[PDB]
Each structure stands twice: as structure tokens, then as C-alpha cells.
Amino acid sequence: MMVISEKVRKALNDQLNREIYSSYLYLSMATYFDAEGFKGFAHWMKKQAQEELTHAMKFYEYIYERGGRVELEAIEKPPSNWNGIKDAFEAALKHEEFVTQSIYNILELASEEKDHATVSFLKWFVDEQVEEEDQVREILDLLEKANGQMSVIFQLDRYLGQRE
Amino acid sequence: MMVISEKVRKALNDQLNREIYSSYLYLSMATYFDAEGFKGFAHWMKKQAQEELTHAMKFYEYIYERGGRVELEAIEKPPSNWNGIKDAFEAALKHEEFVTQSIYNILELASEEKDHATVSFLKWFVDEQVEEEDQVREILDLLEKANGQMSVIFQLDRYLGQRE
Amino acid sequence: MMVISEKVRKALNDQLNREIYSSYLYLSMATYFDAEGFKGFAHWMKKQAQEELTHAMKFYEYIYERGGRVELEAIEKPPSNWNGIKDAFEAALKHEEFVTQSIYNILELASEEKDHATVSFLKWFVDEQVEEEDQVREILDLLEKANGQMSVIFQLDRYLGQRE
Amino acid sequence: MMVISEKVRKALNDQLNREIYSSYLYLSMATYFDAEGFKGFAHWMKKQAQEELTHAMKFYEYIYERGGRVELEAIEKPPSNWNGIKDAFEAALKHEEFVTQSIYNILELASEEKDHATVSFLKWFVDEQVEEEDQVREILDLLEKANGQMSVIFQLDRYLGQRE
Amino acid sequence: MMVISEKVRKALNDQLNREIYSSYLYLSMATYFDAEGFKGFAHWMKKQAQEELTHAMKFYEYIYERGGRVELEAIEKPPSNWNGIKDAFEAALKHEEFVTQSIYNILELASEEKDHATVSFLKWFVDEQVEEEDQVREILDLLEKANGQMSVIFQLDRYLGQRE
Amino acid sequence: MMVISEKVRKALNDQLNREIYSSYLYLSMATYFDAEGFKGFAHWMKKQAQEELTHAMKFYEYIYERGGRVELEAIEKPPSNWNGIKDAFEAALKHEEFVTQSIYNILELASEEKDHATVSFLKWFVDEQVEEEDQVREILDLLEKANGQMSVIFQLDRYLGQRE
Ligand SMILES: [Ca+2]
Ligand SMILES: [Ca+2]
Ligand SMILES: [Ca+2]
Ligand SMILES: [Ca+2]
Ligand SMILES: [Ca+2]
Ligand SMILES: [Ca+2]
Ligand SMILES: [Ca+2]
Ligand SMILES: [Fe+3]
Ligand SMILES: [Fe+3]
Ligand SMILES: [Fe+3]
Ligand SMILES: [Fe+3]
Ligand SMILES: [Fe+3]
Ligand SMILES: [Fe+3]
Ligand SMILES: [Fe+3]
Ligand SMILES: [Fe+3]
Ligand SMILES: [Fe+3]
Ligand SMILES: [Fe+3]
Ligand SMILES: [Fe+3]
Ligand SMILES: [Fe+3]
Numbered sequence: 001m002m003v004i005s006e007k008v009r010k011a012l013n014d015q016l017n018r019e020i021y022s023s024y025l026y027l028s029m030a031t032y033f034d035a036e037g038f039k040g041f042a043h044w045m046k047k048q049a050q051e052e053l054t055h056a057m058k059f060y061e062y063i064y065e066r067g068g069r070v071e072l073e074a075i076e077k078p079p080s081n082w083n084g085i086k087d088a089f090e091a092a093l094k095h096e097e098f099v100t101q102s103i104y105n106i107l108e109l110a111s112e113e114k115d116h117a118t119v120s121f122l123k124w125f126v127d128e129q130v131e132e133e134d135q136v137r138e139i140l141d142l143l144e145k146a147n148g149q150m151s152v153i154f155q156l157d158r159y160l161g162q163r164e
Numbered sequence: 165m166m167v168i169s170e171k172v173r174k175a176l177n178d179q180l181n182r183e184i185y186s187s188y189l190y191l192s193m194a195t196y197f198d199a200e201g202f203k204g205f206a207h208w209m210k211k212q213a214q215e216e217l218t219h220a221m222k223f224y225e226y227i228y229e230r231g232g233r234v235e236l237e238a239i240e241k242p243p244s245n246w247n248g249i250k251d252a253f254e255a256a257l258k259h260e261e262f263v264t265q266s267i268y269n270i271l272e273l274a275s276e277e278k279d280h281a282t283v284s285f286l287k288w289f290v291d292e293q294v295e296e297e298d299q300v301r302e303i304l305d306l307l308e309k310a311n312g313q314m315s316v317i318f319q320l321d322r323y324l325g326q327r328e
Numbered sequence: 329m330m331v332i333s334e335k336v337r338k339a340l341n342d343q344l345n346r347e348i349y350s351s352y353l354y355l356s357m358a359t360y361f362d363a364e365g366f367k368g369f370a371h372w373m374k375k376q377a378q379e380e381l382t383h384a385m386k387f388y389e390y391i392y393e394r395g396g397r398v399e400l401e402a403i404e405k406p407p408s409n410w411n412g413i414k415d416a417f418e419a420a421l422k423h424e425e426f427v428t429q430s431i432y433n434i435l436e437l438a439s440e441e442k443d444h445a446t447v448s449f450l451k452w453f454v455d456e457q458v459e460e461e462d463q464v465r466e467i468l469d470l471l472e473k474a475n476g477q478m479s480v481i482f483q484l485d486r487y488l489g490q491r492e
Numbered sequence: 493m494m495v496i497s498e499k500v501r502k503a504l505n506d507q508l509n510r511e512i513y514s515s516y517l518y519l520s521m522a523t524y525f526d527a528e529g530f531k532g533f534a535h536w537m538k539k540q541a542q543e544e545l546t547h548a549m550k551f552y553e554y555i556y557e558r559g560g561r562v563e564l565e566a567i568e569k570p571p572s573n574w575n576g577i578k579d580a581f582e583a584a585l586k587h588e589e590f591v592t593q594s595i596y597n598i599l600e601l602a603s604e605e606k607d608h609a610t611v612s613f614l615k616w617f618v619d620e621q622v623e624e625e626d627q628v629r630e631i632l633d634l635l636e637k638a639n640g641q642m643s644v645i646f647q648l649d650r651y652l653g654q655r656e
Numbered sequence: 657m658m659v660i661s662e663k664v665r666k667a668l669n670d671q672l673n674r675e676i677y678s679s680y681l682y683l684s685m686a687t688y689f690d691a692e693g694f695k696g697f698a699h700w701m702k703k704q705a706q707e708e709l710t711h712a713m714k715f716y717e718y719i720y721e722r723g724g725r726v727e728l729e730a731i732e733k734p735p736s737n738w739n740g741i742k743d744a745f746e747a748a749l750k751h752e753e754f755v756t757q758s759i760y761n762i763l764e765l766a767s768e769e770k771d772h773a774t775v776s777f778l779k780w781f782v783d784e785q786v787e788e789e790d791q792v793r794e795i796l797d798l799l800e801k802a803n804g805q806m807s808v809i810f811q812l813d814r815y816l817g818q819r820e
Numbered sequence: 821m822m823v824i825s826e827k828v829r830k831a832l833n834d835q836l837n838r839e840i841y842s843s844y845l846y847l848s849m850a851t852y853f854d855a856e857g858f859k860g861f862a863h864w865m866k867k868q869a870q871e872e873l874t875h876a877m878k879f880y881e882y883i884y885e886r887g888g889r890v891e892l893e894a895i896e897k898p899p900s901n902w903n904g905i906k907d908a909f910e911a912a913l914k915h916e917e918f919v920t921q922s923i924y925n926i927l928e929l930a931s932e933e934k935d936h937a938t939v940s941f942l943k944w945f946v947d948e949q950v951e952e953e954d955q956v957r958e959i960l961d962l963l964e965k966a967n968g969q970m971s972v973i974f975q976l977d978r979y980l981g982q983r984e
Contacts, residue, residue: 003425003461024236024239027236028236031224031233031234031235031236034228034233034234035228035233046221060195064198064199065458065459065462066458066462067465069195069198069199070195070198070199071195071244072188072191072192072195072241072242072244073241074238074239074240074241075188075238075239076238077237077238078236080235080236097659100773104770104772107772108770114432114436116432116435116454117428117454117455117457117458120451120454120455121455121458123451123776123779126772126773126776127773127776127777129773130718130721130722130773130777131721133659134721134722137723138857141857142857145857145970145974147970149970149971151971152970152971152974155971155974155975201466201469201470201473314473314474314475314477314480315477315479315480318473318480318483319483331753331789348516352512352567355564356564359552359561359562359563359564362556362561362562363556363561363562374549385538388523388526390786392527393787393790394786394790395793397523397526397527398523398526398527399523399572400516400519400520400523400569400570400572401569402566402567402568402569403516403566403567405564405565405566406564408563408564442760442764444760444763444782445782445783445785445786448779448782448783449783449786451779529794529798529801642801642802642803642805642808643805643807643808643811646798646801646808646811647811680840680892680895683892684892687880687889687890687891687892690884690889690890691884691889691890716851720854720855725851725854725855726851726854726855727851727900728844728847728848728851728897728898728900729897730894730895730896730897731844731894731895732894733892733893733894734892736891736892
């Protein structure tokens with residue numbers, strides 16, 4: 001039997017599909033950075049796309065552990081172009097903040113239903129969104145300092161290109 | 165400057181998006197196998213989904229190597245249900261055969277344009293599809309022989325669950 | 329001096345004795361499986377009994393860390409017979425769900441008292457109960473596929489019999 | 493089929509439940525030592541509790557080895573308050589001597605029925621009881637010599653807290 | 657941009673400065689223990705002072721991760737004398753309970769604002785205050801047993817002087 | 821019995837408290853570098869804050885070695901903002917030179933009282949201050965040559981961020 005409500009299952013399944021789109025959106029940013037010839041920024045975005053899949057699969061696992069089932073939905077076409085490196089990371093930040101609020105909405109839903117298991121499960125994502133948002137903000141602040149200057153941009157590209 | 169034609173770039177880009185859908189489809193099969201309590205078959209499908217992403221990234225890399233750009237498209241909602249283990253693997257064989265013909269069409273289009281670079285590049289995928297189809301056929305033959313004997317199905321699930 | 333309320337200390341002490349009974353209940357299931365000649369299912373239940381003692385000792389330590397004292401209560405006699413292997417694991421699942429709800433009751437009591445320490449302490453058990461219930465549901469699902477087939481049940485017995 | 497008599501099976505089963513109570517009694521002494529702030533004495537009692545469970549499981553194995561079956565009974569509530577350190581260990585000695593006589597009674601019963609297998613099996617517990625009693629007598633003699641001296645009690649607590 | 661409210665930022669910053677004062681308070685207790693010739697107690701306090709600084713730096717990091725800024729405030733002069741070792745640990749316990757309640761007040765503030773990131777971040781400190789209070793309570797209980805006796809106090813001094 | 825004069829003990833104690841303030845000042849400079857997004861400069865200041873604590877503890881241990889006692893005093897609130905990176909390090913140089921003169925003043929006071937042990941103890945701090953001032957002057961020189969060039973400032977931030 002399923003021991004999460006259908007409302008909570010739908011919220012979690014929706015979020016899993018949102019993590020899939022996040023992976024896809026960051027791959028799309030990679031296609032933009034590669035088109036612009038910044039392979040280190042593109043590498044960072046390919047690593048980011050893989051990271052989002054690990055998020056999706058943690059939602060996947062929990063849904064089945066609570067007796068639910070995962071339904072994959074259509075993935076919408078992401079944008080494929082941004083107006084410079086900074087613009088792409090600014091869209092990344094607005095996306096991560098939207099993901100954070102999406103996760104907050106599940107937490108308050110599960111809290112209202114006294115679904116302590118799901119509330120507790122979501123703590124890891126609450127903490128991970130803090131780091132996710134900070135990692136983008138950190139890059140945005142370095143890009144602000146870089147201004148338009150290619151010598152600094154190249155430094156960031158090499159540094160981000162080392163992401164493990 | 166792009167040294168593949170736009171027609172070949174489009175066909176390669178379509179195939180990249182088709183490998184992405186292939187990954188999504190096999191994840192969908194995993195959701196079905198997990199829902200049915202067959203974690204070993206689900207594990208195999210999750211590994212298959214990752215194998216398809218390596219195919220997509222090989223197309224990704226070739227497109228940029230020839231001066232083109234990748235555009236990610238919407239990904240259709242995959243089926244989420246099958247009438248049994250055999251039915252899902254039969255659908256996988258059909259999907260792989262379709263991928264093989266899709267690759268064939270690019271090969272023939274590249275050949276008519278005398279794009280020997282792309283023709284040569286696709287040889288890897290031609291040989292990989294022979295193996296991809298064979299690996300599903302092998303599993304189908306095992307399921308056929310098992311008939312419906314759960315004891316043998318349990319062993320197959322465990323075996324496929326050891327996929328590296 | 330004690331820094332949990334007496335109401336919370338009693339709720340935690342009750343839950344400790346509840347975990348001791350759970351251990352005893354699972355050892356009793358071991359006596360049934362050994363009586364039926366399923367040493368692998370018995371082995372799994374003996375490991376489960378030890379696992380419940382580790383739960384009891386975690387409540388033990390926290391009670392003393394909060395300046396409380398533990399008082400052991402009489403342990404009721406458990407059932408010693410079930411109507412087949414599946415009926416015993418169904419009894420185990422229902423028992424775990426009652427354990428989960430008992431823990432939820434402590435969590436809501438502590439939360440009402442603004443005993444943030446005990447609320448936080450109980451998160452570990454909220455998460456463990458997710459896993460505890462899932463581990464039983466997984467065996468139940470495998471038993472349902474086994475139907476009655478001794479060839480399948482032999483496989484399950486040897487698989488569970490290797491639990492570490 | 494069972495090759496011990498029911499009278500011998502019941503006696504062995506009674507002793508198994510008696511060893512479970514012994515383990516519970518020693519855990520209760522630990523709750524007392526922990527309440528009094530003697531973690532080393534409490535550690536010794538937790539170790540003793542686990543040692544008693546190995547005794548119970550030896551009776552468990554032997555009962556099934558002779559075709560019998562184990563029935564777990566209710567476990568009585570142990571005392572939880574002693575006058576002081578030495579009184580707890582004196583209660584342990586009297587309990588171990590009661591356990592020894594209880595084993596003597598099974599030996600004489602099995603001997604009267606010419607159940608030489610059960611008589612032989614019990615030799616290990618006879619020899620183990622000599623050591624069990626001796627190990628408590630040694631601690632009692634240290635506590636008697638200590639008289640009330642807290643500095644000695646501290647060293648004894650620390651020594652016993654090292655039990656493997 | 658700062659994604660904690662100014663009310664929560666100020667509560668976190670206040671607490672950072674309280675952990676700094678806590679470090680300075682324990683260093684002062686070390687100056688007292690060293691003046692009294694108890695180098696083991698002094699060593700424990702120097703280690704405690706470093707431990708408090710790790711708490712301050714965790715608040716520091718989280719404030720910057722949420723886009724806030726740390727402002728260091730004046731540090732008040734601590735007491736430098738106590739009426740014996742036991743009086744000093746009584747003051748330590750009083751101080752830790754005040755730190756615990758200070759953390760609870762932040763938790764309830766962030767909960768009221770639905771600042772789930774800060775609520776979750778604070779769980780680590782809720783759990784650590786449980787241990788912090790218990791470690792002082794333990795030493796106080798042993799000093800109560802010691803009464804005045806130098807033979808017991810020398811044991812505590814050398815044991816605490818092994819703190820890593 | 822204290823074998824330094826009270827005047828020398830107070831001068832040594834004043835200096836200990838000034839090394840504590842130095843630590844706190846450098847931590848405040850870290851808060852400023854972190855606010856400005858230069859984590860490598862902040863790291864260097866955090867390491868510098870720890871170094872000043874080792875200076876404080878050397879004064880601590882010598883005071884007790886000579887039979888004296890340490891009294892911790894209030895710590896003034898440090899500045900928390902500077903007019904750029906160079907302005908912060910110039911405040912650091914000025915503070916280090918003030919620390920050197922402060923040490924010179926103790927040396928001359930002890931020399932006047934013929935406290936050869938304290939004069940000799942201070943030689944280490946005389947030599948360390950030479951290095952301390954020079955390490956700041958070296959960074960100031962690199963900043964002067966860097967002028968405003970963000971490209972160079974990025975490299976200096978990363979270099980100083982390697983400080984062990
Ligand atoms: Ca990340
Ligand atoms: Ca393959
Ligand atoms: Ca388990
Ligand atoms: Ca023994
Ligand atoms: Ca710890
Ligand atoms: Ca601690
Ligand atoms: Ca230095
Ligand atoms: Fe994510
Ligand atoms: Fe993300
Ligand atoms: Fe493929
Ligand atoms: Fe394929
Ligand atoms: Fe449990
Ligand atoms: Fe359980
Ligand atoms: Fe025994
Ligand atoms: Fe015994
Ligand atoms: Fe602290
Ligand atoms: Fe503390
Ligand atoms: Fe210094
Ligand atoms: Fe300095």
C-alpha cells in the first residue's frame with residue numbers, strides 16, 4: 001500500500017520531473033557555452049546537469065520506499081541562448097530559487113498533513129538548495145568583478161572547467 | 165565556421181534528441197519495473213538510460229567538432245506501463261530497431277552529400293546498434309524460455325541487477 | 329537535574345520498552361521459522377531482533393543525556409505461531425507501522441512542549457522507520473510473487489539468510 | 493521429530509527464558525548504575541546482558557537440534573533500585589547461583605531420563621557458571637575492601653568500564 | 657542579495673558573537689584553573705574555547721552563504737575567578753543552558769518566518785547543545801561524588817587533561 | 821610565588837590582551853573580505869587570526885611559568901569596513917607596527933627592572949614582528965603594482981588563499 005497521500009505523491013513526482021527539467025536546462029546552457037567557445041563553463045554545466053539527475057533519483061527512491069510510483073512527464077524545451085555568460089548564470093539563479101520554493105511548498109504541504117517522514121526526507125534538499133544557490137551566486141559575483149574582461153573570464157573558465 | 169551542412173547538422177541534432185528520448189524511455193521502463201517489484205530489471209533499465217546519455221553526448225561532441233551547435237528540443241512523455249517484463253523488453257527491441265534505422269537514414273543522407281567525415285563517424289553507432297539489439301534479444305530469449313516460472317525470473321532479475 | 333519533562337521522559341521510556349518488545353517479537357518469529365525449517369528466514373529475524381535492541385539503546389542513551397532515568401517494564405508474551413511465512417511478515421509490517429505511529433506521537437508531544445532537542449533527536453527514527461517498513465514490504469512483495477512455490481521460497485530463504 | 497522428552501524440552505525452554513530474564517535483569521542494573529552516574533559499572537552490566545543472550549541462544553540452538561521447538565514466555569519486570577553498588581553486585585551473585593541451581597535441576601532431570609545428550613550439552617553451562625559466580629565474587633571482594641572510599645570506587649568503575 | 661531577513665541575520669550574528677564570548681569565557685576559566693595549578697582542567701577549558709570558535713565559524717559561514725554579512729561586536733570582560741572547580745563547572749552549565757535557549761529563540765524566530773533553511777541549519781546546534789550540556793553535567797556529577805577529596809579530583813584532572 | 825614584578829606582569833598581561841584584539845581585528849578584516857567576495861584574502865585573514873592566538877598563548881604560558889596569573893579584559897569592537905583591499909592591509913601594517921612598539925615598551929621596562937628572563941623571552945616576539953611587518957609590506961607591494969587590475973587581484977586572492 002502507498003503510505004504517502006496522493007497529494008504528497010503528486011508534489012514529489014512533480015518535483016522529480018522539475019529536477020529532470022533542471023538537468024535539461026543546464027545541458028542547454030552547456031550547448032550555449034560550447035557555441036560561444038567557453039569549454040570550461042560548458043563543462044561546469046554538464047556536471048551540473050548530472051548533479052540534478054542525482055536529485056531526481058533521490059526523489060524517485062523515496063517515492064517507491066513510501067509505496068508510491070513515479071510517472072515521467074513531458075520535458076519542455078529549455079531556452080538555448082542567453083545574452084552573455086552572466087545572463088545565463090542569472091537565469092540559473094532564478095531557476096534554483098524557484099526550485100527552492102517548489103521544495104518549500106512540499107515541506108509545508110507534508111507538514112500540514114503531519115507526514116513527518118516526508119518533512120524529514122526534505123531536509124536534505126532544503127540544505128542542498130542553500131549550497132546550490134550559493135554556488136551560483138558565487139559565480140555571479142566573480143563575473144561581476146570580471147566585467148567584460150576576457151583575461152578574467154578565461155581564468156573563471158579554466159577554474160570552473162576543473163569541476164569534479 | 166560549420167563544415168557540416170545544415171541538413172546533416174539537423175539530422176545529427178535530431179538523433180541527439182532521440183538518444184535523449186531513449187534515455188527517458190528506459191527510465192520510464194525502470195519506473196514500471198520498480199512499481200512491479202523487480203529491482204534487478206529496473207537497475208538494468210537505469211543503467212541503460214545512462215548508456216543512452218553517452219550516445220547523446222557523442223553526437224553532442226561531433227556536432228561541435230564540425231563547427232555546429234546543438235539545440236535541445238522538447239522530450240515527449242514516454243509510455244509508463246507495459247503488460248509484463250517481456251512486453252517491456254519487446255518494446256525496447258522495437259525502439260532500438262527504430263534507432264538503428266534512424267542512424268541508417270543519417271548515414272545515407274551524409275553519403276549522398278559526400279560527407280565522409282559524418283559517414284565514418286556513424287560507423288561506431290552502426291556497430292553499437294548491432295550489439296544494442298542483440299543484448300535485448302538475448303534477454304528476450306531468456307524470458308521466452310523461462311516461460312512464466314517465477315524461480316527463473318527471480319534469477320534473471322538478480323543477474324541483470326549485477327549490470328555494471 | 330532532568331531537562332526533559334516527565335511526560336516526554338515517560339513517552340521515550342515507553343518507546344524504549346516498545347523496542348525491547350519488538351526485538352522479542354522478532355525472536356519469536358525466528359522460533360516459528362526455525363520450527364518450520366526455514367533457517368534463512370529465522371536468521372533474518374534474529375538479525376532483526378538485534379537491530380531492535382540497537383534502537384532501544386539509542387533511546388536509553390538520550391534519556392540519560394537529558395538527565396532522565398530508564399525503567400524497564402514487564403515484556404508481554406509474543407505470539408509464537410503464524411499461518412505461513414507471509415502471515416508472519418504481515419504481522420511484522422503492521423507492528424512496524426504501529427512503531428512508526430508511536431514515534432510520531434512522541435514527536436508531536438515534544439513539538440507541543442517546544443522540546444526542540446527531542447523533536448530533533450527523533451528525526452533519526454522517523455527516517456529509520458521509513459526504511460524499516462520498506463524492508464518488510466519488499467519481502468512481502470517477493471513472497472506474493474513466490475505464491476507458494478517452494479523453489480522461489482528456497483531462494484528467498486538463502487537470500488535473507490545472508491543478511492549481515 | 494523431537495528426540496528429547498517434553499519434560500526435558502520444557503526444562504530447557506524454561507532455562508532459555510530464564511537466561512532472557514537474566515540479560516534483562518543486568519540491563520536493569522545498568523539503568524541503575526547510569527542513574528547513579530557510574531558509567532563503568534553500567535558498561536559492565538550492558539556487556540553482561542549481551543553475554544546472557546549468548547547463553548539463551550545456545551539453549552535455543554540445542555532445542556532445535558533435538559527436534560524441539562522454543563516458546564518465548566512473558567518476561568517479568570526486574571527491580572530497578574538497589575541500595576548501592578555492592579548490593580547490586582550481591583544481587584547478581586545470588587542470581588547467578590540461582591541460575592546454577594536451575595541448571596543443576598535440568599542435569600538431574602535429564603540424567604534420570606538417561607538423556608545423555610542433554611546431560612553432556614549441559615556441561616558447558618556448569619563450567620561457565622563456576623566462572624560467572626567467580627567473576628562477581630571477585631568484584632564483591634574489591635568492593636568490600638574498598639569500604640566506602642570514592643577514590644577506589646572510581647578506579648573500579650574505570651577498570652570495569654574496560655570490559656571487552 | 658541577502659535571502660535571510662534582517663531579523664534572522666541579526667539573530668544569527670548575535671549568536672555568532674555569543675559563541676565568541678563563550679570561547680573567551682572558557683579561556684578565562686583556564687586562566688583560573690592554571691592559577692590554581694590544575695593543568696588538566698585548564699587544558700580541557702582551552703580545548704572548550706577552541707570548540708566554541710568552531711561554532712562561531714559555522715554561524716559565520718552560514719551567514720555569508722545566505723548573502724548576509726557578519727559584524728563583530730565588543731566582547732565583554734568575563735569573570736576570571738570562581739569559588740573552586742565545582743563552582744566553575746556550575747557556571748559553565750548555566751552558560752550552556754543560556755546558549756541552548758538562545759539557539760531555541762532563533763529556531764522559533766526562523767520557524768515563524770518560514771525560513772526553513774535557517775530552521776534546518778540550526779538542527780546541528782540543537783543536537784550539539786544536548787551533548788554540550790551533558791558533558792558539563794557529567795563532570796559536575798563526578799565532582800559531587802568527589803566531595804572535596806584531592807585523590808578523586810586528581811583523577812578527574814588527569815582524565816580531562818587527555819581531552820583531544 | 822610570582823617572580824616577575826606586578827608592573828611586568830601587567831605589561832605582559834596587557835600584551836596578551838592586545839594579541840587577542842589583534843586576532844579579532846584580523847577576523848573582522850575577514851568579514852570585510854568575505855563581504856566583498858574575496859575568499860582568498862578572507863582565508864589569509866582567518867589564518868592570521870589564528871596566528872595571533874598562538875602569540876597570546878605564548879604570553880599566557882610565560883606568565884604562569886613566572887608564577888603570575890592571566891586576567892582577560894574586555895575586547896573593543898574592531899572596525900568592520902575598509903576603503904578597498906589595499907586600505908585593509910595598510911591598516912594591518914599600521915597595527916603590526918603598533919604591536920612591535922608595544923613589545924619594545926615591555927622590553928625596555930623589563931630591561932630597566934633587570935628582569936633578564938623577560939627581556940630574553942621577548943626576543944622571539946621582536947624577531948617575529950620583523951617577519952609579520954614584512955609579510956604585510958610584501959602584500960602591499962603586490963597590490964601597489966597590481967593597481968586596479970582585477971586579473972592580477974584574482975591571482976593574488978588565490979595565492980593568499982593557499983596559506984597553510
Ligand atoms: Ca551543487
Ligand atoms: Ca548496450
Ligand atoms: Ca532494518
Ligand atoms: Ca562471564
Ligand atoms: Ca559529538
Ligand atoms: Ca563539546
Ligand atoms: Ca606571520
Ligand atoms: Fe536539484
Ligand atoms: Fe539545482
Ligand atoms: Fe543510443
Ligand atoms: Fe540504445
Ligand atoms: Fe525499532
Ligand atoms: Fe523495527
Ligand atoms: Fe547465563
Ligand atoms: Fe550469568
Ligand atoms: Fe557553542
Ligand atoms: Fe558550548
Ligand atoms: Fe602578534
Ligand atoms: Fe601580528
